[PDB]
Design a binder for this molecule. Structure first.
Ligand SMILES: *[C@@H]1O[C@H](CO)[C@@H](O)[C@H](O)[C@H]1NC(C)=O
Ligand SMILES: *[C@@H]1O[C@H](CO)[C@@H](O)[C@H](O)[C@H]1NC(C)=O
Ligand SMILES: *[C@@H]1O[C@H](CO)[C@@H](O)[C@H](O)[C@H]1NC(C)=O
Lengths: 170, 316, 170, 316, 170, 316
């Protein structure tokens, strides 16, 4: 939680959000709706994908036998070979464990960031017509019919339309 | 009144490790270390050779077993635990260097060395190299004295590699089971075999005497080999105990040798092989065989290293 | 300072804060108080701990002699051995230096993050009853008795109670 | 009026490096590269062997020094700079391979090879292998002709490994200080020693002649060794210059060998050893000995690599 | 875009900003001006510099021949050598590619952070006298003559001076 | 009314890779993998030696080619494809070990070994080692019998290293083109050469016989070498086929050897050399020669790895 959204100021995830990774859940006069956000969901996805594309990789370098499983090579040479190979195992095993931990840290942090980024986008959309409840909700100081909610999701909410009324609920 | 934003979760996510915390539950993860075998050498797409009874070095000298393989072609060569390079008891000097050279050679193209012999036996044979009863290494002439105890003529033979690649030249030194049998085969008095080119230069004395009864023989054959450069020439000086090359070997193209204990299968296609199968995987790591060969995922100690592919998972 | 709080908009640390890593310092009618925040302090600590737990590690791989300090092995073989070992020394020396630098970068940034996260938590708590002084202070537009400050630290500050008065100090 | 939030600081923090900046001051840091020795081989918990004067290879042949160690048991074996494998001057063929084999063997269990000899001296001795004045390698019979210049009988001896593990077999070739002393010990004319199993097959001629006066001798003993498989058999053919095995060696369990210059200590417990001590540490890196052995922290060039364990430090 | 500013809520860069990396572009009564911000620009620069300093590095370790280009060494030994060297080539090639990708990720994110940090600095400066347009602009609810703009850039904008008026444009 | 903040951009930025995305356009980047050669061994600052026709091992034995180089001094030594260690046909036992020893030696300081000979020829020569017509390895005396077929006296020679460093000692074994020419040069009957110190101990038999006609000779010289410790002593026992050292070699200081195919240049300064030039670069990686030597950038498979040095680039 480098960004403090996921597993942070948002209390927990929505096991119902089967539509995408991020989303809005509104409550108005008409009832209550949950919708997923394509842009943020898709970005988080694009990025994790990119990680995969990079990590699912084949090096075009062939390695051949220097050992012999059937008739064991000379002891000193085979011992040097065993030592080199074991040392190399140590390096890659480390490289793998580190790579995976670092990548998981960054993946999680990245998702947290995408959440924050979305929240802050909506916050910016509202401007002065809503206040932050601190749990990842915006209390809207005007009346938000289902078309309004929709407008907030498709980023077409004009704060000017509702400024007077909302402000007036000072 | 209100609009809220959130993220998904699942009831049962999977645990992964991070820089900072062990076993954090995230939504989805994927495996990074391959553990999945295919108990069969995936040969499809490449020309394969299974040697079985044949030993790899044997494909040059040509004891009974390797008669199938005296001029083989390959892309993938396969050694088997039962393989043998030998019929009449003996080791190859620098055996493994040669084995490695052969495993990458794409096969061998054999060719006569034009050796002619005067006033001696060319047809030495034994009850170990079975075929028509007693015989010998189909590429080696067992040079013997004209009759028992007959002093073996001091001889010299010679061969020029007249090809663009180099030439593999094997010869053998018969160490007799007793001083009696040596002078029975080659005549009394000292014996030497000298071998020289421009690269090589070495020489051999036979060592008669009794060793353990491997294959019913007590004496042994020391096999020696050299590489002969294009335009270069080999010379043999000798007066006994010399198992002569009849043909020389040339390397065709390119290949890869594996030591397998499992079936072949030209249905599936592969590129990483290990003694007990094939490893087909996209994963950048494997935990199967340290020693596996081909184009391979890096080998690691770890059974599993799960790579998160989803956000922190926080259920209700 | 990926987050700009520590060694950022907060001017400097408090050598007096011996209680924890993060904390509130209030000034009201009754005087002036400093207290440490358990949750944020404890999180930063938990994480650095996890780093340590991972980095203080023993590999269960034995390595034996291929060399000889008393009677030196054959020159060509011992030279190959020296070359392999020196190359491997190069790799681990790099791996160590990099690991440490990357881990220090992330540690610092993570602390910065925990600071921001706390700040923003209080901001969220206060809603509309306070304004941001930009130095990492909140000027409260109402009267904040020691019980009030306490409530802000134990997260029990109800902004409703003071909204009227604070707002009214427009 | 106001509530402010902050973080701690200390007047004197410590500097660490980051991806981005060198020597940034953070609150607390911790060391990551171990530099801390213990000038003593921490032997506690494991069965130790200090050889001192004894040389490791010696424990097979058994010169004076290694009489303590002819049947030793170990978990940890310790070579000392003064150790010696030899009393009568001579090298071991493939010495270091063998040394490595012994350092991991858990000790040796010796056993008679049942060699009986007819009509020759079995009790050759020398003023180098001191005990009761002159003696020999407590595991080797110095075979000699029945009296001076007496032609040494052509002999053959044999031994079957009848155990589940393989058997270590050492023998020696005496190279006499002069052709005179050779024919004085074994009689005139050529001499050969042949050695063969199924694995092995090699042979030896003595080389009489004068070399530098090591230990008051001019001639040398070449020690040769082979490994003998379960069910297998060794055969020796010879007529002189042959230093015969009396017993064969078997490997007990498992161990680790170190080359130390420092005292033992069964008070402290350890797992990483280097020539000048023990390294007990949790740290994942060390800067002490490139060559250190056991279960060890990775060796690095760097004296110190400080790992920050606290936030950026910004004092007043 | 870990921070969502660069290639985020700011729509795009300014090909005209030849003065520095970050900057203000104001529109008032008197016209329209663009200026660069020294502090943020210089910080992003200081850091990338630090990366370079670390990455442009020479190890003081000499490596000598164990091979032979003219007369090829013995096959088994040279095959072991070829295998060790090729393995080490694999490790470094990986270390290099990873180092570069990780460093580019962090560099980008760091710049994104510097942008955010600057924005938020100005936001903090304004306090209550301006509102966030969401494109990385601040609409100022008072009159900002060129001296005022200047004051905002050299960090000498006193919000007290303009609070009454700006607020009053509620 | 409004104040806006932003960042710069450029129309044409450059693409780099990240953990998350391939080929993202950022403002400025810099190259990280060096590809830039200098077709010339940058020798300035360091004392150089180009051997050309001389082979490195030759600088000890001293055939015609290496007469320039019998006592050379260096910091940087340079082998050339045409170099040769030999005039009269023959190999060096353990050649490459020695080559490596010499490439780091800072040069050689030669010194007489005080060998005197009685009642034999000291001045053997041949039509291969051309100078004044026929000659020999300017550091080796070709010991010959006093006249044809004259039995070669059993001899012994000896040398003590009386310096603080060790001493390089080379000797040779002449393998004659025929048993006839051997007994023509040294007399009939067996021949042995034994060589011993405290470190070393080994011996040699000549192997007469015909090999391929390299340099117009059919027999060969086996060169052997040992290192001789301070205070130590070498002894040679022999009765023919022995090519004797006249002088011993000592190692001056320190140097580095390279195998180059390109010109020297003492204008430019360098520290990383590869067969086809010099690599001067700050970059931590190179894609030029796997095998390059000196103080070098790590070798990597990748042609280019661009490191972003500027922000994401977003033009209008
Ligand atoms: C190398 O390790 C393998 C483990 O599969 C072992 O079988 C072999 O004996 C080792 N080689 C030697 C001789 O040290
Ligand atoms: C190996 O390097 C060590 C120093 O770590 C040195 O003491 C030794 O002489 C070298 N030996 C060889 C043959 O590499
Ligand atoms: C090592 O590789 C080089 C080129 O990469 C090649 O020329 C050489 O033949 C290889 N060595 C051996 C003996 O395989």
């Amino acid at each position: 939680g480098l960004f403090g959204a996921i597993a942070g100021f948002i209390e927990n995830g929505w096991e119902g959000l089967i539509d995408g990774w991020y989303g809005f859940r509104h409550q108005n006069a008409q009832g209550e709706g949950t919708a997923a956000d394509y842009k943020s969901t898709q970005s988080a996805i694009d990025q994790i994908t990119g990680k995969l594309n990079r990590l699912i990789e084949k090096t075009n370098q062939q390695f051949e036998l220097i050992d012999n499983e059937f008739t064991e090579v000379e002891k000193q040479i085979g011992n040097v070979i065993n030592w080199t190979r074991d040392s190399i195992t140590e390096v890659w095993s480390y490289n793998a464990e580190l790579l995976v931990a670092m990548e998981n840290q960054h993946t999680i942090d990245l998702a947290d960031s995408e959440m924050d980024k979305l929240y802050e986008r909506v916050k910016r959309q509202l401007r002065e017509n809503a206040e932050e409840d601190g749990t990842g909700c915006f209390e809207i100081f005007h009346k938000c019919d289902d078309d309004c909610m929709a407008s907030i999701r498709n980023n077409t909410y004009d704060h000017s339309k509702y400024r007077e009324e909302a402000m007036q609920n000072r | 009144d209100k609009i809220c934003l959130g993220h998904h979760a699942v009831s049962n996510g999977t645990k992964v490790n991070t820089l900072t915390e062990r076993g954090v539950e995230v939504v989805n993860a994927t495996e990074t270390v391959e553990r999945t075998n295919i108990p069969r050498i995936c040969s499809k797409g490449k020309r394969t050779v299974d040697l079985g009874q044949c030993g790899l070095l044997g494909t040059i000298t040509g004891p009974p077993q390797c008669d199938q393989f005296l001029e083989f072609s390959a892309d993938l060569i396969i050694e088997r635990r039962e393989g043998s390079d030998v019929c009449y008891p003996g080791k190859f000097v620098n055996e493994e260097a040669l084995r490695q050279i052969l495993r990458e050679s794409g096969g061998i193209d054999k060719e006569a060395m034009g050796f002619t012999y005067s006033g001696i036996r060319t047809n030495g044979a034994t009850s170990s190299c079975r075929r028509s009863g007693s015989s010998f290494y189909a590429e080696m002439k067992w040079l013997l004295s004209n009759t028992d105890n007959a002093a073996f003529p001091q001889m010299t033979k010679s061969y020029k590699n007249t090809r663009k690649n180099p030439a593999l030249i094997v010869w053998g030194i018969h160490h007799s089971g007793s001083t009696a049998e040596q002078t029975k085969l080659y005549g009394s008095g000292n014996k030497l075999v000298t071998v020289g080119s421009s690269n090589y230069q070495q020489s051999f004395v036979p060592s008669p005497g009794a060793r353990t009864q491997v294959n019913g023989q007590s004496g042994r054959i020391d096999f020696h080999w050299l590489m002969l450069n294009p335009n270069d020439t080999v010379t043999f000086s000798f007066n006994g105990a010399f198992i002569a090359p009849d043909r020389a070997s040339f390397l065709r193209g390119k290949s890869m040798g594996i030591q397998s204990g499992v079936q072949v299968d030209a249905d599936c296609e592969g590129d990483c092989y290990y003694s007990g199968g094939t490893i087909i995987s996209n994963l950048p790591f494997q935990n199967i065989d340290s020693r596996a060969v081909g184009k391979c995922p890096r080998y690691v100690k770890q059974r599993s290293l799960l790579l998160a592919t989803g956000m922190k998972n926080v259920p209700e």
